[PDB]
């Protein structure tokens, strides 16, 4: 569901940030987390769903 997806995406990005050695991977992770936080603070479920899908892809990279 939505909430679980948001949380799981935040967890994924946080762990990638922690385990990344390249500061550009850490920057990308932090940027996606900020968008999630901002979208979720407004209950903008549409943007949250879009950002989650982008996050899953950038982690597959």
């Amino acid at each position: 569901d939505y909430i679980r997806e948001l949380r799981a995406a935040l967890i994924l990005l946080a762990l990638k940030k922690q385990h990344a050695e390249d500061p550009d991977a850490q920057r990308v992770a932090d940027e996606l987390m900020k968008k999630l936080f901002d979208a979720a603070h407004r209950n903008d479920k549409d943007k949250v769903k879009k950002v989650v899908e982008e996050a899953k892809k950038v982690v597959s990279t």
């Binding site: 909430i3 679980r4 949380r7 935040l10 967890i11 762990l15 922690q18 385990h19 979720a40």
Partner: protein
């Protein structure tokens, strides 16, 4: 089994947890339920206080593949730096809110492991944040206690409203 997670402003989250004196199979069964609850939420850590069990037990998994579940019984931490870092934290007991909290990001952890044997660990980064967040819970502290009075009250009123609908 999946345990119910208490939510702010429930007063039982202010209980100070008691130390575990014996790490028996009943403790390990609780730990196993805490992990199941944590993985299903999902979250990366959980304190027994959050599932209304007021014993000093914390579980965690900071691995991307759920391969490194970690147990901290009777945990204590001590900063190894005066440097303060910011991390935007959420909490399964304060669901839906994510706010920056300032914490040391280098600490020494002392605790008992899942067998009851003592160990020490130097923690940095996310593990340092998580252990402080989780120890806070065992002392009856929530991350909203670091926020301003007005920000905390807006969170409290929003959750109180959600709960009124839940009942």
């Amino acid at each position: 089994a999946i345990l119910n997670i208490l939510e702010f402003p429930d007063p039982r989250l202010r209980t100070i947890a008691k130390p575990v004196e014996v790490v028996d199979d009943a403790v390990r069964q609780l730990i196993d339920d805490m992990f199941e609850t944590m993985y299903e939420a999902p979250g990366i850590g959980l304190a027994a206080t959050q599932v209304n069990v007021h014993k000093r037990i914390v579980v965690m998994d900071l691995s991307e593949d759920k391969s490194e579940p970690r147990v901290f019984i009777n945990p204590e931490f001590e900063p190894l730096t005066e440097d303060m870092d910011q991390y935007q934290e959420g909490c399964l007991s304060v669901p839906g809110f994510y706010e920056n909290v300032d914490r040391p990001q280098k600490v020494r952890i002392k605790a008992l492991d899942r067998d009851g044997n003592p160990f020490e660990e130097v923690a940095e980064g996310l593990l340092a944040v998580c252990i402080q967040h989780e120890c806070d819970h065992l002392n009856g502290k929530l991350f909203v206690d670091y926020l301003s009075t007005l920000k905390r009250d807006r969170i409290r009123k929003k959750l109180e409203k959600q709960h009124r609908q839940q009942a």
